[PDB]
Every structure is written in structure tokens, then in C-alpha cells.
DNA sequence: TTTTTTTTATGTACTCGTAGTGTCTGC
DNA sequence: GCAGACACTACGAGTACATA
């Protein structure tokens, strides 16, 4: 997904919110909860296009007006966007402070003002708290739009302010049909990709479009080699990358399917890789699988959360600890009770 | 483009000044001596006006306009001295040096000093523009293998009787600080007019003013010298170096050690070192390190390193300077380490 | 047009007198007694949870302090000072979003300007909300003023986390704690609001909104606005139940029965069925924890079990009869840690899967088939 | 009393003479001896926790330095200088709020005027409040001033954490340390306050207030003012207990006993009563944990219990000698894990009940019965 | 006023002759020989810890260099130049509080006087005190002056941290590093100072005062004056012991010592005192954990003592030798669990007490 | 013998160069 | 007038350091 592709699974919610916004019964601060690539960006863009210019027929775009000319070119000064600096990774509180004071300085063109945060989960504590008063009491006809993948990660003091909207994932069969139309791959691979992305067709499309599929198949081959021999260290060659958290999530998914197979669950998530799950079930004990799953999830969370942490050291330590666990007579860890 | 050592500098200085002299290295004492000798011989040749400029992203850049080629009003030959930053020149400093070199003339002698330039910068346009006109002086700190010979040579320079034990003590206390060593020799000459130097006072007129680098610490770890490793760690902590640079320097070598130990069971270390492109200085050191350590010790080391990294970048605590110490003892001549203390 | 913008209930229904509070009586009694007598202080620090009323309480305190009727426990909206305080544009009430301006320079400028006499107001009230975000330099700057301020200066601070504030600042102010609102108070306030707004509602929807508000009235109002937007202009039980993903069937009960029976196939089939209908996982885990709590209570006292879950009483009675208390406690602990772990491994489905697998691990899953 | 101006107790009752200062006998005796005998040092640093007197004692020393009756250890209230000091309008008591004037330029300005002599005073005092707030350059600008000050200038510094000052400053200035006030001292001072001010009070409420603001008297004064506000202008036990959110020790120990003797119905009844009273559940867990810790301490030594819990002292002993310490360790661990995991329970009431039920199930002596069917 | 006149012990007793400086023998001897042979470097930079005489020795150097009797290690008090050095009003001695005159404007103004000949002295002597803090451009001006210094000007730089000084100034300055004063020398001079004044004293009290100061003479004298004030005009052992107990800070070490010996009453008294001396309980427990870590590490190799434990080495060596590694490991695990468990406990004093009780319960002491 | 090597977010001082502002001096 | 000079004050930028 390059940029802002309209999604049919977004059409219903969209009009509903328009019905709320057109009648003047819409909350100023709306927090979107959607999966990565679910299309929340397109929803926010369409909403802002509706809001920020002369009233169109009442639906669709805003026609051919000054608002559309400025918005499409990205020149509208009443369309404030909060995006992390590419050199950094988080929304500096200075950017939010500047945006809030600029909003306080009244609009420039006719109409309302729209502030859009490209991702709420990337807000630091100071940046998140710098928005509290502005959300509580917007100056005049100010509408916010915050996108997130889970509202619980966001501060409780901010989740109170915003009316929460939920973009439910599309039904799995419909998403499978859509992806098969969009991408020519076998049904099993399609299903595994969809379940890997928690039913987010946009995320699955992003996974297929890039090299992520090649990385996943390389990781699968490396796991197939490593599982019987017990030489998990080689997996490092496939795990160290800028997308390390996603590959660790894939590994955790494989371990989850292995435990599922041990319990014989009717449903799995790595459908198109039965050989690896069979090998993992055969060669590894359920307690060992659970321990490895816990360690992998913990390492993924530590990599994703703590900014600046060294990827290579953590991945190597995880692999060596797994190596230690595979050896007989080694006490496995348990969740912190 | 002449290349020289400080000891040979007089040989070039008494022959005739070149267009410019470049004083590259990391020894304050050697660079200071070379610069002072060049300035002294220039004054003997009739150079009187000296201007010193420090190369900085915000410093003045009037040095270009300072080449008026019109001093003739007084006609005092000028010497220009430039101080490069810690990391060397940047692009902007590159073209500044280009335009300074383009305006060089006979009446002006240019003295350039700073940290040794890397290969990426040794091909810079200005440095090439100094070809056939410049004399580089190599001033790099002698290592502990070569340091005592240098100390003995300087003691003979001052006509002082240096004992072997005194030489060893001074080498141990003032490692990596040549200026401190010169000051100590002067101070001990002042304390003892007789000229001899023996233990009873050279162990008294000395301090632990040694300056180290993370590479020295990693070398101490590889050679398994616990006492030197701990002393180096203490000196680095006192100096104030950031612990993250220590963590990275040790992480690189520890990961290489883990990979080499894993591959040693199937391939001789001689081919493994060449495949991993290990320099001849470090091949034997890493061979001894591999022969000393087992897989379990390396696994414990990496576990401790990971815990230190987490407690540094997540809790922001100051316990790192302790944990590194344990990691030191974890990899030297039978660590005899623990689990709760690290795990 | 009375609503140029949507005056959301979280803003339109801000209290204007002391009688509009939903029951913060412990602090209101102290405030009324202090205003009624001469006992007035120069530093009030209201703390507590989100959306509980401390900013509104502070604004009401300012209104009572500055109204030209006098120092009245009940402020009068007729007063011009109250008219200006309820809106913006009051020369005396200086409201500073502390998180917006954390720099010590702004605090130093404020403390330079505090010296001047108030304009036409009895007390120059400084209302600093979200005070816990101020930089430590500003915190230390706010020490010597709060201890011996000019008589005409009153400081009102509000924060959601007293611990983050330095102990020195807490030591100079009156600390009021605003307890989280109970279910009944929130439900009564919501029914009063909806009756005043001529919007239809149902008691079950109001009860669900109060339950999900987690003790914060602003959460209740936001959920009510969610229901209004997604309920076609009325608060209906179906709309709120659907939006909250709450459980009306025995899915949680069947899931915990399968888990305690250690039937992994049944557990995973039920979890897959739950994923099919898109049941919210956090609510499922909360319901399972509540059911396990009821199991423990009935094990301790069978009479306590007699509750709303009457139609399913036999099942919980059998589970209490057949399961030791230690296993129930281990199950509750595992599910609770799992609930702590939902906002980890962003795909929450596999998070609940992890929690269920950990819970299942305690009992033997041996392939040994025995009755 | 008669003052219709209800001045805050934190402000009205600031110490006037060295006789009005409670506690801190160390600093009080040191200053009295160093001012009666002479030998006044040129820099003081009062280091202590919050609300112990880090500033008022400095003002008392300032009064004692330049008084009309000469250098005296008893600051009078008759001469103009002392009253001007108390009003804060005194000419020579330059009160440097170091938090505001923290930049090095302001410190240079302060040092520039040091030699310009005092006006209507034996000494000029530079009372620098919160010195731990100055910048590094500001800290170091005044070194040679502190080491060799003029004969008429005396510094009086007051910081909460001296560890943040550079070590040389700790060298130059005298290091006076003020210990946190004890509970009995706080109770006596509050009794003095509520007797001088005509407010009816009850001793149990005063003890509760003193304990709830441990180590800091200004905390106690603020809590007492807020309790006067909460009550009908009188410090009663009910008002203080309801305000603090604390639960009376007798009833918490009653819950603890019901837990120890495995009486589930009594535990449930007490929980229901606490729910009816509106006491915060986490506060109930906190009180139970504190009582269990006190039980452990009295197992360590019977002297660990002061008069504070005297009302139930006997019961305390009857819990110390009847159960082994390992049971206390298990109980403390269970209740503490419960407190840690409370915020994620279905409800705070549900979480507290489940924690108590877990402590009841897992406790060794007479545990809960297990199902008859294996 | 009506209290006669009593100065400060820190400012008084400052040495006026090289024989009155106690300790730092190597620096004084080197300076004496350099002045005797006429071998004087252009710039002398003093360095060392606080309160070891760097400024005082520099002032003595400035007095000696301009003495009319000649450059000597023992300048007389007779010379009017020497007397003006005493009073602080000497035209040829330029005392620059570089901690206050950091800006390049003032430094350049005061360094533009190098062109002027001394008024009544052989050498124009600059005493730039606290040189470590100084603007970068002021360092440039000072370096330009020192590169081509007039023959009638000598520099006397003083500082506490020589690291902050640029290397270009260090390479041009003869650096003299001063050691932290040994305890015996501190006690000896404290005895002599107390005897020269009309103050009674006690031997154990004197030893306690000497040990309390961390090798710095100014610290020792400041504590001496404070104890005299608290001691009712007498340096008595009980009064100074109580004073130092009030000012006692290294609580964690005593806590470890009491915990490892299973002394319940002692550890309870220590934690009560640490509560009265208002501190942070998390910081105390972290310090205890770190001390236990160090004790565990020292048993593996003595070199772990390092430099930080120079004033703590005596007790740490005994603790490391006398305690088995397993007990130290168990104590470290208990304290780590307690620190993880502390915030969720009741008020943190209760949690620290409970963790200490947990650690104490391991030993069979009853 | 030669290169080798870093974790950010937010804030607070400090000091120098360049410009903007006042004002007033014999110009 | 008077505008330049000269002061004087403020602002950006580069650097160093602190706390979390
Ligand atoms: N005690 C209360 N009485 C009535 N409404 C309340 C009360 N507390 C909160 N609210 C509602 O919550 C909204 C926000 O309240 P606010 O006072 O800002 O809470 P906070 O203390 O977190 O700042 C108000 O607009 C009002 O609708
Ligand atoms: N030792 C004390 N005796 C009597 N009152 C005290 C004492 N310490 C603090 N207080 C009370 O606290 C108020 C302010 O005390 P203060 O001396 O400012 O503490 P700090 O040391 O923090 O500046 C005083 O007005 C007084 O009522
Ligand atoms: N070597 C010493 N001999 C005698 N007194 C000393 C010595 N070092 C420090 N002192 C004492 O400390 C006081 C201040 O000493 P000073 O030399 O100013 O220390 P600094 O090195 O920090 O400038 C002196 O008055 C003197 O009493
Ligand atoms: F939302 Be409130 F100010 F805590
Ligand atoms: F209120 Be005190 F000066 F900390
Ligand atoms: F005067 Be010293 F440097 F403390
Ligand atoms: Mg608020
Ligand atoms: Mg104070
Ligand atoms: Mg000094
Ligand atoms: Zn349009
Ligand atoms: Zn009114
Ligand atoms: Zn008086
Ligand atoms: Zn003389």
C-alpha cells in the first residue's frame, strides 16, 4: 500500500461518521482504532477533505474548490499534520506544542480547522500530555483525528477525551477473495498471511508487496534446518533486520501453531507450512515450546518498546538462551507470578 | 609529500622549511614538540607573526582574508596554525582548506594539526593539493611493548639515570599519557638534582593519571588480564567516557568470539581468522582467547552483556559501571563467576 | 444555531454550581465549610483519576472565590465575575496548561507577574492544570511563592498523579483526593442528563455505560456520545452491547469450563468461534475473571453464588464441587497476568491465546485417555 | 483566635524565638552555643527533608545575628530589626530565592554588591533558599566569596538534598543537618496549636494526623487545616479518619484475625461493612499489609511496637506468639501480589475479595477443604 | 559586636611559609629546587581534590616570586611586598576569580595588561583561580598569551578538575597534582591547631574528626569549627560522635554490616536513623545492592577494590574475606527481590524494613 | 601498525556573533 | 535636525550538562 488507497471495508463506517459530522453531532476529538494498514489514513484523509473546504453535495469529495486544490497539493494551512521526524521515531513535544499554539492563533482560510495525528501510539508522554487541554476545550470548530492500533497503549488521560471509533477487520472470506483478486497466490499462503496480520488485508498486501515474503520463506527454511539439529544460532542470519519485530512475531506465530498442533487445535495460523509445524511438534516438548514462545514474545516487546536498544545483541542472546533451553536438564522459565 | 617521525623532524627542519607541515596523530606531547620545533626553526629562518585558528563549525574564517600578501608594511613573515577537531575535517572544512591551500605562498608557512585522518579523508582534495609540498609527521602513542624504550630514550635525553623498576612503574601509572610522562620526568629531575631515578620516590611522585581507550579494555579482556582490565575500567569511568561505547566495543569482539568458537569445531582457526579478516596483530590474541574460553563462559558473558544493555537503556541506572566489572572477571584466567550476581 | 460546533456532553454539562457535582461530598463539605467561614487557603491540590471533576471543582472554587456577591459557598451565576469565569476572558483567573508550558522560563515570568495587584477581583486565582508535567526547575521555582504568597493570590493545582509531583510541593498545599465514581452515581447522572436532553434511553444501556466507564464520568459521557452517534439518536441496549462487544451468551462460561476440563481442542474451537464473531478479548478475559471470582466465592460460601447468573447456577455449582480452590486461584492469576499482557504482542488474539495456553498448562494435557 | 483573618497555620505559627521550635535539638543547641559564645561562621547549610524547618530556622538565625541588643541567642520581638525580619521587609535580609535567580549572571550580580556594607544592621544576610537549584556556573561563581567573604556578610543556605551540591561547597559552608520530626513531637505541637487556637479536638484524631504526616511538620499543619475544613471547624476522630481514607487499626486487625483463623464468613462480613463505609479497597489492603509488617517486626523484637497502636497492643502480642514468621511471610507475599495485580482485576472489590480468598486458600494451618471427589 | 572577635578556622591558619603547608611534600620540594636553581617554567598549573592547599600554595608561590629578598622557597614576612600579599592588596599579583570572570571580555581585558611592566615586583604574577570553568574564547586568548609570554610574567593556574581544561593549555603548563591528605597528617595538624588555640580536645574525638573528613584539610577544619560550636567550647568525644552520627551518610554500609551479622536491634536502629535523616528508600536499597555486588566481586579478585572504595576499603576487605560467597549471593537475591517488590508495598520504609527482615531470617541467629 | 568503535526525549544553562532598538553628541 | 556612534538589549546557534 503506497499511499491512501480507498478500501471497501471502510465505506460503511465512513458514511456513518459523515452522518455524525454533517448533522453537527460529531465529537471534536475522535480516536480511530484500526489495524496497521487497515486504511485509517484514507478514512482520516476523506474526512478532512469533507471538513476543510466548502460544503460539497454532502458526500464523496469536496469537488473542484480552493480547498481541494490546497489539500491535494498539501498546501492547506488549516490541515495540521503530526508526523515524527524521519531521523527520529517519536512525536516530539515541540511539534505538538507548535501545532497547538498555531491552532490557538485562529484559522487562516474560511471554514473549520483540522488537526490530524498520523499515529497516536508514537506519542511520547510529554507530547501526549501537551494535547490534553486542547482536546478538552478546542478553540473553535476544531476537529482532531488520532490513529492507533490499540487504545490501551495510549494514556488513560487521553482515551477519556476522545470519542473512540473502531474499524473492525473485514470477514476473513471476503478479505481472502479481495486479496486473491489483488494478488495471485495460493489460498493457503493467502490465509496464513491474513491470519498473521490479524485479518488486516492492508497489512497482508504490504507484506506481499515488499520483500517480507522472501524474508519469511528464508526464515522458514532456516527454521526447518535448525529444528532437528538444534543449531538455532543460524536463525540470526534471518532475524537481524530493520523489520526484526515483525519476524519475531512470525516466529512466535510458528511456535503458537506448534503448540496448537500439540493440542490438536482445529484452527491454525501457518496454514501453508505444515512441515515446519509438524517438525516443531515432533522435536520439541510442549513446555519447551511454551518457554521459547514466551522468550520470543518478551524479546520482541523489548526490541519494539525500548528505543535505541541494540538489535544484534538481543537477538543473539535470545538464540543462545533458546540453545540452552533445548539442551536436556535445563530449567525452563515461567511467567512472572 | 614527505612522511616523517618526530625524531627525524630536525633533519627536515635544518634542511629547509617546506610549503606546509601537517602534524597528524593523537599524542599531545609529540604534536606539541613538533609544532614548537617547526615554530622555532621558522623564527630562526625569520618568521615572526604567528596566528592560531581552531577549526570549528562556528569559528572565524578570516584566515582566508588574513593572506593579504601585503605584510610588507612591516614585512614580518607569517606562520599560520590550524587545529583540526576531534573527528577531523568535514565537507565544509574540506572546501575551507581547499581555498586556504589555493592561497598559499612562499612567505607563509602552514602548520596543520589534529587527529589522524582516515582513509576516506586522506584522499580529500585539499590534502592532495598539498602533494609534493607537505611533510606529514606521524605521532602515535607507543604501546606498552614500545613505551619503556621511549621512556628510557627520554630519560637519556634529560641525562637522568632511570632504573628498570622505575621505568615499569612510570609506564604502568602513565599509560596513554605521554605529556604526563614528560611532566613526571621533569618533576623527578627537579626533586632529585643528583639525576638518578629509583623506586623510593618515583613511586611517590606519581598518580594514576593514565588515559585509556575502549580498545585497550577489549584487548585486556581478550588476553585475560583481570587486574589490567579492572584498572582500565576504573580509569575510563573516572575520565567520564560513555558506557555505551564500551558496550559496543566489547559487543563486536564478543559476537566475533562466539561465532569463531562455534565454527572452530569444524574448521581450523587459521582459516577462520582469514575468512573473518582478522589482522595479524589480533590473530594470536583471539586464538589465545578462544583456547582459554568455553561456550558456557561466552554464553554467560552475552547474558550479562544483554542485562547490562537493558539496565542501561531502560532503567537509566548507574549500575552499569559495576556490571561491566563483573563481565571483566567473567572472561579472565578461570572467571569463577556466579549466576545470581549476573543472570 | 445554538451549537455552532457540537458542544459535546463532556463540555456542555460542565457543572456551574456546587449542586451539580455527582457526589464528591467529602471534598465539597470541606470546600463549603472553608468558604462559609473565614478559613481560606492559598494552595489547593485536587488529585485523583481521569474525568472525575477536579478541574470543574477548581473552576467552581474560583467562581465562589471571585463572585461579587461575596465569598459564597454557592456561587451565583448572576454575578458578572461568574459570567466571565464560566467562559474565557477573565483578567484574574489565569489558567495555565502546565504540560503545554513546562519550561522554567514561563513559570519564572508568571512568578514575576504575580506581584501585581488583581484587577477588580478579590483573589488572583492561578489555576494550573496537569501540574505533574512541569519541569523540575519549574517545580522548585513554585516553592517560595506557594509558602508565603501575597494575600490576593490563590493557587489551584490539578493533577492525575500526585506521586510524580515532588514531595515539597505536596507539603505546602491542601491535598484533596477525588474518589472514582461508583456505578450508581454515574448511572443516575447519565439518566438525569439524558432526561434533560430529551434523548431516549434504556436502563440496561445506562448500566452498561456506567460499568464500562471504570469510575470516570468523562468516560461515561464519551461512551454515551459513542452510543448516540452509533445508535441513531437514541441510547439503546443493542447498540451499546454491540459497540462494547459485551457477552450475552455463556461463551466465557463454556470457555472456562473447557479450560478447567483441560480440553485443549474445545478451548481452541471456542476461541476460534469467538474470533469469528469478533468478540472483544479484554471483555472476555474480564468476564472469565469475574466468573472465577464467583467460583471462589461459592466454594467459600454457596449462598453468595445466588446472583444474576441464576440460569447457569448449576454449572458453577458443579465446577466449585469438582475443582480445588488452588487450581481456581492459579487460573485467576494466570488470566490476570494475561490481561496485564494484552497491550503486548500487538495482535491481541494471540495474546489471549498465550494466556489460555498458560492457564491450560497447569493441568495435565497427557494424551493418556482416561475417564 | 480573635484574628478574623484565618491565617494558614503553616504561616501564622512560624517560629518566633528559639523556644518556639519543636525538635531539632541538635541544630538549636549548636546555634545557641555558637551565638552565645561567639565564633559565627560565614556560611550555613541546613540539610533536611521537607517541612522540617529548613527556612524558618535560618530566619531565626538571621534575627539572632543583627539584633539591637547585640549578638544574642534569644531573638527579642521588641526591636525594629526582628519585627522587620519577621515581616519580610528587612533591608539587610536579602532573601535570594535561588530557584528564580539561578542563572550565573544573577549570581555575579549578587556577588558584585557583597562589599557595599550593611544598612541598619550588624551583618547583611544573604539567605539563599533552595541552593541545590543553582546552575553549575552559579555554584562555582561564589567559591572564593564563600572562602574569603567580607567581615559583614554571612550566607545562610537551605537545601533539601545536599548531595546535588558540588563537594567544594559542602566543604566551605557549615553542614547542619535537621532530622525528620517524630510522631510524638508532631502530636504535641498540634495540641499546642489547637489549644492556642480555640478549636475543639480529640486526642485520637491528633495522633492520626501526626502519624499521617510522618517526618514533616508542615505536612501535619496542612492536613490539620484541611481536617478543620472537612469537619465542623473541629478536629474529631471521625472527620480525620474519613478524610485520610485510613481505616482504624482495630477493625483492620479484626479483618486480619478473620483471615488468619480461616473464618471466611467473618472476612466477607467485614469486607461488606468496609464497602458500605466507602473506604477505598486499596487503602484496606495497605492497612492490612502494614499490620502484617508490624506483626513481623514485633516478632523481631517486642520493642518494635510503640504507643501508636497501644489501643490494640494486647491483640498484637496475641498475634505475634501464636503463628510462625513463615506464615507472616506467606501472608505478606499473597496480599502484596494481590495489591500489585489489583488494578487489572474485574473490580477493585472483586480483586480485594479474590486476594483475601487466595490468602485463605493457600494458608497452611486449617486450609480450605478440597473437593471430596479426587 | 559584643562577642570580642573570633575568625573562621578555615580561613585562619592558612600557611604563610612553605614549612607551614602540611603534606604534599613532593610539590613543595620540587618548587623549592626549581626556585633555587633558577629553573622556572612559564606556567604552573596546580590540580587536585578540594581543600588540599592548591590556592594556598599558589598564593605562597606568588608571595615568593616577588619577594625583595629574592626568589626563595621561604619568603620572609618582612618585605612590604610580602605584607601586601598577606593583605590581598598587591599591584603585581593579579588574582582572577576565573569562576566569576569566565567571559572572554573580562579575561581579555585582564590579559591585555601583560604588556605593562610590573610596578614593584620582579615578575607580574597571575593567580587565575578555578581555571576549569572558562569560556572557549577565553581559553583561546589565554593560549595566545601563553604561546608568546613575556619574560616578566608567570602564570599560576588552580583548579579541581584538570580534565575540563583543554589539552592545548595542559601541554604548555607544568602541572603539579596534589594528593588527598593522609589521615595521620590531618590528625597531626588538627592536634597542633587545637593546641595553638585555647581549645581542649580528646584523642579519640580528634581521630574521629580526622577520619570523618575525606582526606581534605578544609573539610577537617570546617567539621572542627562545627563541632566546637556544637561541643559547647570543648571538642569532647561524645558530642562530636553524636554530631557525626547526625551527619552520618554511608548508612548502606552499616546496614550491610548489621544484616550480615544478623543483629536485628542494630539494623532496626540504623534504619530508624536513616528514616530520621530524610532520604530516598529506593536509593538506599540500590546502594545496598551495589555494595553487596562489590563484596561478591572482590572475593573473586582483590583488584575489584579500585579507587572509589579508598575510604571504605578496610571494612569491605573484612566483609569479603569473612563471608562465604553463597551467603552474599543469597543476600543479593533477597535484596533484589525486595527492591523489585518495594514500590507496591506500603510506605517504602515499611517495605525496606520487611526486606531487611527477610534477609535477616536466613541466619539461625535467634 | 590500522581500523576498529553511540541511546534517545526534554529541558536548562552559558557564551559568542549579529541584529534590532534608544538617544544623544557634538556632529 | 541628526545619523552615526555607541550603548544596550535581545535573539539564534553551538556547546556542555542533567534527569528520566
Ligand atoms: N462531580 C461531577 N459532577 C458533574 N459532572 C462531572 C463531575 N465530575 C466530572 N463531571 C463531568 O466530567 C466532565 C469533565 O470534568 P472535569 O471536572 O474536567 O474532570 P477532571 O477532574 O479530570 O478535569 C465535566 O464536563 C462533567 O460533565
Ligand atoms: N521545628 C519546627 N517547629 C515549629 N514549627 C515548624 C518546625 N518546622 C516546621 N514548622 C512549621 O512549618 C512552617 C514552615 O516551616 P519551614 O521552616 O519553612 O520549613 P523549611 O525547612 O522546609 O523551609 C512553619 O511555619 C512552622 O509552622
Ligand atoms: N596543605 C595544606 N596545609 C595547611 N592547610 C591547608 C592545606 N590545604 C588546605 N588547607 C586548609 O584549607 C583552607 C583552604 O585551603 P585552600 O588552599 O583555599 O584550598 P583550595 O585548594 O580548594 O583552594 C586553608 O585555609 C587551610 O586551612
Ligand atoms: F481529566 Be481530569 F483533569 F483528571
Ligand atoms: F518547605 Be521547606 F523549605 F522545604
Ligand atoms: F578552593 Be578549593 F578549590 F575548594
Ligand atoms: Mg481536568
Ligand atoms: Mg524553605
Ligand atoms: Mg581555591
Ligand atoms: Zn471541496
Ligand atoms: Zn457570585
Ligand atoms: Zn531584636
Ligand atoms: Zn620578603
Author numbering:
A (entry chain E): -2 to 334
B (entry chain A): 1 to 343
C (entry chain D): -2 to 368
D (entry chain C): -2 to 371
E (entry chain B): -2 to 363
Task: Give verbatim excerpts from the published study on this entry.
Clamp loaders are pentameric ATPases that place circular sliding clamps onto DNA, where they function in DNA replication and genome integrity. All clamp loaders are pentameric ATPases of the AAA + family (ATPases associated with various cellular activities). Here we describe a series of structures of the E. coli clamp loader in the process of placing the clamp onto a p/t-junction.
The Closed-DNA1 and Closed-DNA2 structures reveal how the clamp closes and yields insight into sliding clamp release. By comparing the Open-DNAp/t and Closed-DNA1 structures we infer that the clamp closes through two motions. Despite this, the conformation of the clamp loader is essentially identical across Open-DNAp/t, Closed-DNA1, and Closed-DNA2. The only difference between Closed-DNA1 and Closed-DNA2 lies within the contacts between the clamp loader and the sliding clamp. In Closed-DNA1, all five subunits of the γ-complex contact the ß-clamp, although the D and E subunits lose substantial contact relative to the Open-DNAp/t state. We propose that the Closed-DNA1 conformation precedes the Closed-DNA2 conformation in a trajectory towards clamp release. Previous work showed Arg24 and Gln149 of the ß-clamp are important for efficient loading. Our structures show that ATP hydrolysis is not strictly required for closure but is more likely to drive complete disengagement of the clamp loader.
